[PDB]
Amino acid sequence: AKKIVSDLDLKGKTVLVRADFNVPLKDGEITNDNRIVQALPTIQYIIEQGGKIVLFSHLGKVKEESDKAKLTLRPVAEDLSKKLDKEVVFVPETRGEKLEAAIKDLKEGDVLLVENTRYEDLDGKKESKNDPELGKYWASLGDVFVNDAFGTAHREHASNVGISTHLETAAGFLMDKEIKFIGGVVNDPHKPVVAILGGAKVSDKINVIKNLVNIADKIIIGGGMAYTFLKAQGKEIGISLLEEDKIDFAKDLLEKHGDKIVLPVDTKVAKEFSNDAKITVVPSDSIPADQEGMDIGPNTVKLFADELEGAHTVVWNGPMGVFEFSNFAQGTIGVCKAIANLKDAITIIGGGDSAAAAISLGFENDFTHISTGGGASLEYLEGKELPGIKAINNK
């Protein structure tokens, strides 16, 4: 359905490219070049086709004047030069004569990087609120647009929807996998589909549950959000976090979709919120009054893993316990391993917390798809039509 960069006539064209260069900084030093590594194939491909590259990205959150200096894109242009073993031209303006002239001087294969798109947010939040003038102005600097930034696809900015309204628009190779796999879940899934939901808050996951409940055969629930559901079933949960205003939603979900919903059968509890606390492993029916459910138990890890067998798609969104603590990490590790182990199934990670956990665990290569867009991937799963995607042309 969507136009991809490899569908365009690029040669001799000035190609505007929205790339995700929002990389981790420290004193203005790149601590993790991974978003740059990943942006590479779209760029290298446009170089091969003899395009003239003009790159746009945002970097951090620009609220006031003193935020600018640590959020310049100069360090990205320099890193991108090393990676490309070719010099990227960096212009430290978001518009004007010097920018315009440098764009015109580009020959085929040349790569230029425009300063932080969120410098435009200082006077009027123009980038972030998609000012009509800014989108049109940026679009007028080139012949075609490639949006390779899934991470901002759920939001309407000058740097995505803005440029897209003025120019033929295609997905980059990165944007395209996110559409293929995440969009695939919602539009034409490889059934059976199993969703694993985690994290601390029921709240955060209510909309994904309402959409996924008619697509998935099973919704597996762990992490802190699970204890509310247990409570909804009449169990005591101790001092585990509870969202009382989400009990009716839980009770009714269980009534409408009973066995579809798979919950923990044991839990690791502790009296104190600390990696050094005495942990005890109990059945779900014997959570102590003074204790807090901080990880799923070993029987649950096993049960959750068994519940995957036969699935042709698994979507995972959320840690199974307090993953930040070594001794409460096993539940997430175990479920992560089960999904990476599962043969003949598309396996998808949505959510920043799950993506980081899997990556730090050694598992990046063992999942069919680990999304690059924390907030975006979830909204996409919720069945929202992301504005950055709507604005890419169909093929």
Which one is catalytic: 109, 352, 374, 383? 352
Q: Is 18 annotated as a binding residue?
A: no
Contacts of 135 (CB under 8 A, 6+ apart): 158, 161, 162, 163, 164, 165, 166
Q: Which amino acid is at 323?
A: F
**Could you tell me which of 343, 261, 354, 287 has the C-alpha nearest to residue 310?**
343
Is 183 among the catalytic positions?
A: no
Q: Is 393 annotated as a binding residue?
A: no
> Residue 114: enclosing H or E segment and its boundaries?
strand 111-114
Q: Is 95 tagged catalytic?
A: no
Residue 324 marked as a ligand binder: yes
What does R_g of the chain's alpha carbons equal in angstroms?
23
Closest CA relative to residue 263, chosen from 352, 198, 192, 330: 198
Q: Please tell me whether 310 is known to bind a ligand.
A: no
Q: Is 242 known to sit in a ligand binding site?
A: no
Q: Are residues 99 and 54 in contact, defined by beta-carbon separation less than 8 angstroms? A: no
Determine whether the annotation assigns residue 354 to a binding site.
yes
Q: Is 166 annotated as a binding residue?
A: no
Is residue 93 annotated as involved in ligand binding?
no
Give alpha helix (H) positions in the chain.
34-48, 74-84, 97-104, 132-139, 163-164, 173-178, 184-187, 202-212, 226-232, 247-256, 298-306, 330-341, 352-361, 374-381, 387-390
Catalytic residue among 18, 35, 52, 218: 35
Q: Is 20 annotated among the ligand-binding residues?
A: yes
Is 155 labelled as part of a ligand binding site? yes
Residue 59, annotated as binding a ligand: yes
Residue 362, annotated as binding a ligand: no
Respond yes or no: is residue 177 known to be catalytic.
Answer: no
375 part of the active site = yes
Name the active-site residue from 201, 302, 337, 384. Answer: 201
Residue 132 Cα to chain centre, angstroms: 27
Q: Which of 235, 375, 383, 384 is catalytic?
A: 375
Nearest CA to 53 among 183, 135, 146?
146
CA dihedral 356, 361, 364, 370 (to 10 degrees): -40
Residue 351 is labelled as binding a ligand: yes
Residue positions annotated with a catalytic role:
35, 201, 352, 375
Provide the annotated binding site for substrate: 20-22, 35, 58-61, 118, 155
Provide the annotated binding site: 20-22, 35, 58-61, 118, 155, 205, 293, 324, 351-354
Provide the annotated binding site for ATP: 205, 293, 324, 351-354
